[PDB]
Design a protein around this ligand. Structure first.
Ligand SMILES: CC(=O)Nc1ccc(-c2cc(CN3CCOCC3)c3ccc(C#N)cc3n2)cc1
Length: 16
């Protein structure tokens, strides 16, 4: 998958 951390504000950054 991809583009999941975008909803949070990181786009695609490490887990937490
Ligand atoms: C506190 C808090 O929310 N913490 C947290 C935990 C996990 C993530 C997270 C989620 C996804 C994607 N999902 C895709 C479906 O199966 C599970 C993972 C990611 C996908 C790609 C990348 C990269 N490079 C990082 C990701 N990071 C971001 C933040």
């Amino acid at each position: 998958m991809w583009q999941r951390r975008q909803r949070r504000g990181e786009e695609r950054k490490a887990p937490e």
